[PDB]
Design a protein around this ligand. Structure first.
Ligand SMILES: CCCCCCCC/C=C\CCCCCCCC(=O)O[C@@H](COC(=O)CCCCCCCCCCCCCCC)COP(=O)([O-])OCC[N+](C)(C)C
Ligand SMILES: CCCCCCCC/C=C\CCCCCCCC(=O)O[C@@H](COC(=O)CCCCCCCCCCCCCCC)COP(=O)([O-])OCC[N+](C)(C)C
Ligand SMILES: CCCCCCCCCCCCCCCCCCCC(=O)O[C@H](COC(=O)CCCCCCCCCCCCCC)COP(=O)(O)OCCN
Ligand SMILES: CCCCCCCCCCCCCCCCCCCC(=O)O[C@H](COC(=O)CCCCCCCCCCCCCC)COP(=O)(O)OCCN
Ligand SMILES: CCCCCCCC/C=C\CCCCCCCC(=O)OC[C@H](CO)OC(=O)CCCCCCCCCCCCCCC
Ligand SMILES: CCCCCCCC/C=C\CCCCCCCC(=O)OC[C@H](CO)OC(=O)CCCCCCCCCCCCCCC
Ligand SMILES: CC(C)CCC[C@@H](C)[C@H]1CC[C@H]2[C@@H]3CC=C4C[C@@H](OC(=O)CCC(=O)O)CC[C@]4(C)[C@H]3CC[C@]12C
Ligand SMILES: CC(C)CCC[C@@H](C)[C@H]1CC[C@H]2[C@@H]3CC=C4C[C@@H](OC(=O)CCC(=O)O)CC[C@]4(C)[C@H]3CC[C@]12C
Ligand SMILES: [Ca+2]
Ligand SMILES: [Ca+2]
Ligand SMILES: [Zn+2]
Ligand SMILES: [Zn+2]
Lengths: 664, 51, 664
């Protein structure tokens, strides 16, 4: 038998106090008034007594939305501490008004009335409290190192984090941004960015800051949604303190704001500047138009070079035409790259016709990269993540040019390639040019963003490359482990190349041999074993060491089971899970990426593709009027868009019953 | 609207078919406003099925 | 501009009729009574007038649960047709009572009050209507061919199917089975089975019959759940009209009823007959006990053979001990099968010691199979789906014995195997014995049901074999297509075996050749190409027919892309989808299969494993009392377990308001 008692005892109520609290709960005004008037004279009932749940008479009256009993208790001067917080959390406007006109707590000490109202996101109570001059303390820098911040963190790191989270919950309230904010959209953008940075910094409190940032982004998107005309939309997007605010939204990674259907419609209308009816056209018509504009890109470039002010000179400045011209230029460059591989004994030969036509494109690519670096800046250049591949391409092309020049000025004779040096400059130049061709042909992935059916796919692939990068670390660890083991076991039986059947040593011979004789060769053997191109007889030695052969073959089999069976299916499961997490947001991400791609063609700089590139207070008032209209519409829409309801209904019915019984 | 097709329509079924087809074509043409026209066409198809 | 009008016009109401209907809707009793009394004299208001929604005054009064206005309208003799159906569908007991005491319709003509009450599954109204002698028409056979059924199907196949579905919805009601049913459990079992058969037969109306059968199964499971003692449970399971009703539930594939925690507890208590505390034991203790009982299975079998009435004679009759003994016998049989492969030039050699010890096991297996066929019957034998593998094993073993006998009595000399005939009886006997060994070793899959961690897995694999069978058809179609094509292209260049390097022809040589020379060899080449064991040089001919070689290689590549890339990943997706559909029900399916496995060891027949096998009205009254208790408990539990509620609240408030205003 387990005895049950009250381990943490409290002060029980008397019979009269319990009767008074029950009368307050039932809403009987007459009995409560009589009890108060009698407590004034006899002092037999404590009006500030709690209940077994901790609520007092005032808290019970607030929870039941009984304004009459609330006012009756307030007129008798009951304890009122923290009652405003309970009235605000209950989201009852009349109670808040009555408390503005005049121990254990469910609210933390740092909670203030305005902060709690912002937490509740109730426009009425927030506006009530903002009518009075109320103020939220300013949060310090995300990485602030002042004496006050470190002192508060060392004294109490739980109180400090809780206070910061409460302040950022108050500031991130959509109703508190609709009011008391000069620019709600820019405030929402900055607040979302700062909350994302705090989520990055605060690891434990990450989900809350993430959801607050997402709430701010959704607030900005809904504010943009309330626009009802193109004039208002272009006033919003072009406000600067064109498309300045849209560029700011792109800077703060506001994907929901950018992917707005109206914003995307405006961007598409700007994108097809020359063609007014591109939206309603057949597939064959669009294909023929694109092919015709692409085949005429040198004519358009030359017309822009000669006279920019003409029917053909400024025709390339249109964003879609500019994109088509750049794509056609890159396609011709890749076609010449394909032609390049179509005497070969010359040591350091002069460049051929195809290479002489390739050189202008390489120079134009390098000049365009350095011009983008000089104009846009450094951070914008490194934020692209495609300028890395462009830098690799340009560096490899420059190395190819340098090695070609060196081999031309250091060699004159025509010696057959069979007796050339392994590190001959021509060979290194050819290898670097082949790698550069691979990279240049792979550079066409960035054009999948301009397509409707190839954009979300590319976004999904970019997002799934992160799971592959995560799996690559563990795969490489296992690979290094097994390579070290097999090398340690097999390096004793290394044989010279002359002893091999065809003077060939390694796994790239017809008969593979010395697969695990060195660390590098062991790494390559275990890499090629993933694809099955490593034969099983490589785990063999000429000596009759059957135990060593079996141990090596079993190491090989263990590596096969770990990589091909465990790691590969594990990576498949990882990618399968990661893809479903992008299925929903694929369209918004693609629209943001395509918006960036479109905005990249809106500038006057870089108009000519290679190789032709080497040859005012009314605004603020209009924006404020539009913002006022948007705020009104958004407040109305959000207003238009449990047991407490039934409890309020029961309280009303009981109060009406008691007053009818008293009247009759 | 299903109620507006139940009334003021000689043939509700053929009207629903044509309206679903035209809303699908508009969804194909109007890229930004695609989900709304898709759901309206699906609503018309469901109205015909329920009829 | 699209003009909008009323294409299907109706008869509009007058002002007085609309006012009367509005008074009925608002619940004002005085105005409605005055309107009725005035219509009696002046005949100005039609009391049976509809509304724009088709409802009359009586229907409006029923929908608002206004019993006073309902009775007032009934006393004035308003039209009452089909009002009972609306009162039943509304699930208002008082309205049904008032209508029992006394055009367009929302109910089909075949709907009757008792049928609609059964559809609503409302115990109160169903009992009300069953108090009166009410009767549901009997549905005919699922495959009935009488004149009435075919006549009704040919005259109106929509009315007939609708009537059948309504009747089966009425009969499958849990409340209508709680009442008016001698045995609710057996009725639920039979009804679920018949609804499943109807779902199989009625393809268009499949989901409805499936959900009705599942509802009946859940009703039976919940009736079993209401048991509160082991006595009641064993009374239910042992009722026969032991474990007779449990065997009936197993026969009707009642997986939810069988997998009941209390039923499974009783079956486990019966399963561990010898060990009372097997539930609370360590892993090592259970493992040692199982190993000890398995190593002593011949002693237990011999003790049962000599004296069944002893501490060891009847110790094998315990179900768990019997299962352990049979498993140990099969394990020893497989161990001897492994020993079997451990002079070989004898044509038709006599059997060795291992084969002489294997023969008793084979004879015992055959005798056990035919004894199961003779005892259980034919349908039960073919329902197992494992007796197919047992039949294959026994047929192959019998063929092995026959071929061994023939080779022994037809050959005496000792000729080396190199010059033996291809179809020598010894070779066929050895091949059949190897296939039999494969099948016997694969027979251990059926023992995974007895394990907790291996049972649901085996169920999932059995359920995923159906998707593989579905994919096999399309894979074989594509395989046959490409095999026919490659054969048609390549059969001209077939070369003799002597012309081959080592007098070897086919794909099983060191140098593969003639891979697509015949239909059979083409099928095998394309089969082995799935696993990559078919080299690429088989798509080559000695002649310089480069076009033919390229066309054949491209057929091969197309087949590779279709099978390995498309079909294989498609099958992976199929199995991935099909597995999640079994994840939820895996435990119940495993518990049903394990219950069947346990019940298989409850019989006296087949006690000795191979090779030792070849050497009363109180019951019904108790069951009825238990069933009455269960029905009461289930009704109470189901009773314990939208806009119409708010509409009823508003109607009550408005009626009270009007009566208060009239009184004052
Ligand atoms: C993004 C990351 C950067 C990518 C771009 C890097 C651009 C850098 C370009 C610099 C190229 C310099 C070539 C070496 C010349 C000097 C020389 O003599 O070679 C010596 C060594 O030879 C080597 O080590 C060859 C190295 C080739 C690097 C290939 C990078 C592939 C990037 C793939 C990216 C996927 C020969 O020895 P010896 O003296 O003759 O004796
Ligand atoms: C479940 C489905 C059934 C499965 C069990 C079947 C049991 C049946 C058993 C019957 C076995 C009869 C052997 C033939 C003897 C006659 C003979 O001379 O062979 C002739 C032909 O030879 C053949 O066709 C061999 C056929 C082997 C069948 C193997 C079945 C594998 C099932 C795998 C299942 C997975 C030799 O020709 P000749 O006259 O010498 O010239
Ligand atoms: C002896 C060795 C010889 C080797 C010769 C062959 C070498 C082959 C190398 C192959 C490398 C291929 C890399 C291709 C990556 C494709 C990624 C596609 C998806 C994608 O769009 O990624 C974008 C980044 O681009 C990128 O990921 C660009 C990657 C550049 C890699 C440079 C090094 C290679 C992300 O988009 P985003 O980051 O712009 O979006 C910012 C939103 N906020
Ligand atoms: C020249 C050719 C030489 C070939 C030599 C090698 C031949 C190898 C043949 C391999 C065939 C393997 C078949 C194994 C099937 C395993 C199925 C495991 C899952 C499972 O429990 O399936 C149960 C049926 O058993 C079964 O599926 C038994 C299958 C018997 C197949 C017999 C033919 C082979 C279903 O359980 P259940 O149906 O009892 O559940 C009734 C609930 N209502
Ligand atoms: C991921 C990070 C670590 C993962 C940890 C563990 C993964 C599981 C361990 C894998 C053990 C593989 C053993 C291979 C082996 O013993 O035989 C090679 C050698 C090759 O000679 O073969 C044997 O020694 C006997 C082979 C008998 C069958 C071995 C069955 C092991 C697993 C089989 C299939 C899995 C597909
Ligand atoms: C399933 C039921 C039918 C499925 C229907 C269609 C499936 C897709 C059709 C597959 C066409 C495969 C073509 C193979 C081929 O042309 O080359 C073989 C031959 C082999 O000599 O190679 C070529 O002719 C040129 C190869 C260039 C690359 C071909 C790319 C095709 C698909 C590639 C990869 C897919 C992984
Ligand atoms: C696929 C194999 C045969 C290699 C072919 C290489 C190129 C000829 C392909 C590869 C990627 C293709 C590009 C993928 C994406 C687009 C976007 C597309 O733009 C649109 O979708 C129209 C809508 C718009 O951009 O306003 C223009 C064609 C283009 C450049 C494609 C042109 C043809 C490209 C360069
Ligand atoms: C796995 C490789 C090495 C081949 C080994 C063959 C056998 C030695 C294995 C294969 C399947 C195993 C069986 C899988 C399932 C079970 C159920 C198990 O029963 C239980 O789980 C205890 C609970 C109960 O049955 O009451 C008894 C062991 C047994 C027969 C296992 C015994 C060992 C078996 C026969
Ligand atoms: Ca760039
Ligand atoms: Ca059997
Ligand atoms: Zn600070
Ligand atoms: Zn019939």
């Amino acid at each position: 038998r387990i005895p049950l008692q009250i381990v943490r005892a409290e002060t029980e109520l008397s019979a009269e106090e319990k009767a008074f609290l029950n009368a307050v709960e039932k809403g009987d005004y007459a009995t409560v008034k009589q009890a108060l008037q009698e407590a004034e004279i006899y002092y037999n009932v404590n009006i500030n007594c709690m209940d077994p749940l901790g609520r007092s008479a005032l808290l019970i009256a607030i929870e039941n939305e009984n304004l009459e009993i609330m006012e009756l208790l307030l007129n008798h001067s009951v304890y009122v501490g923290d009652a405003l917080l309970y009235a605000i959390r209950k989201e009852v406007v009349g109670a808040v008004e009555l408390l503005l006109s005049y121990q254990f707590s469910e609210f933390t000490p740092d909670i203030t009335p305005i902060m709690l109202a912002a937490h509740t996101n109730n426009y009425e109570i927030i506006k009530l409290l903002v009518q009075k001059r109320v103020t939220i303390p300013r949060p310090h820098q995300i990485r602030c190192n002042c004496v006050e911040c470190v002192s508060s963190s060392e004294v109490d790191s739980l109180r400090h984090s809780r206070s910061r989270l409460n302040i950022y919950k108050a500031l991130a309230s959509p109703s508190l941004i609709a009011l008391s904010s000069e620019d709600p959209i820019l405030t929402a953008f900055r607040l979302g960015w700062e909350l994302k940075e705090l989520s990055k910094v605060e690891n434990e409190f990450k989900a809350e800051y993430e959801e607050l940032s997402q709430q701010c982004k959704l607030f900005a998107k809904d504010l943009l949604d309330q626009a009802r005309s193109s004039r208002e939309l272009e006033i919003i997007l072009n406000h600067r303190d064109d498309l300045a605010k849209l560029k700011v939204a792109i800077k703060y990674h506001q994907k929901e704001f950018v992917a707005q259907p109206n914003c995307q419609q405006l961007l598409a209308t700007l994108w097809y500047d020359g063609f007014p009816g591109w939206r309603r056209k057949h597939w064959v018509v669009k294909l023929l138009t694109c092919m015709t504009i692409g085949f005429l890109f040198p004519m358009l470039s030359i017309a822009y070079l000669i006279s920019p002010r003409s029917n053909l000179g400024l025709f390339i400045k249109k964003p879609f035409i500019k994109f088509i011209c750049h794509t056609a230029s890159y396609l011709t460059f890749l076609f010449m790259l394909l032609l390049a591989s179509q005497d070969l004994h010359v040591q350091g030969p002069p460049p051929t016709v195809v290479e002489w036509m390739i050189l202008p494109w390489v120079l134009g690519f390098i000049w365009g990269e350095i011009k983008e670096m000089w104009d846009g800046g450094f951070t914008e250049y490194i934020h692209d993540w495609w300028n890395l591949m462009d830098f690799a391409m340009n560096s490899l092309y420059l190395a190819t040019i340098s090695l070609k020049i060196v081999a031309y000025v250091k060699y004159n004779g025509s010696r057959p390639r069979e007796e050339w040096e392994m590190w001959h400059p021509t060979l290194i130049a050819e290898a670097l040019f082949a790698i550069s061709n691979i990279l240049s042909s792979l550079r066409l992935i960035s054009l999948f963003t301009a397509n409707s059916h190839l954009g979300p796919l590319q976004i999904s692939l970019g997002r799934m490359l992160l799971d592959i990068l995560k799996f690559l670390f563990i795969y490489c660890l296992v690979l290094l482990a097994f390579a070290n083991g097999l090398n340690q076991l097999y390096f004793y039986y290394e044989t010279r190349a002359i002893d091999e059947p065809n003077n060939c040593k390694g796994i790239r011979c017809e008969k593979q041999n010395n697969a695990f004789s060195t660390l590098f060769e062991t790494l390559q053997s275990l890499f090629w074993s993933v694809f099955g191109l490593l034969n099983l007889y490589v785990t063999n030695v000429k000596a009759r060491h059957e135990f060593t052969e079996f141990v090596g073959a079993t190491m090989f089999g263990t590596y096969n089971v770990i990589s091909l069976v465990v790691l590969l299916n594990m990576l498949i499961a990882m990618m399968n899970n990661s893809y479903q997490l992008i299925a929903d947001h694929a369209d918004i991400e693609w629209k943001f990426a395509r918006t960036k791609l479109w905005m990249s063609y809106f500038d006057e700089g870089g108009t000519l593709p290679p190789p032709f590139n080497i040859i005012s207070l009314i605004q603020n008032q209009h924006y404020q009027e539009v913002i006022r209209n948007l705020v009104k519409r958004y407040v109305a829409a959000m207003i238009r868009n449990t047991e407490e309801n039934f409890k309020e209904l029961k309280q009303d019915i009981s109060s009406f019953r008691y007053e009818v019984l008293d009247l009759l």
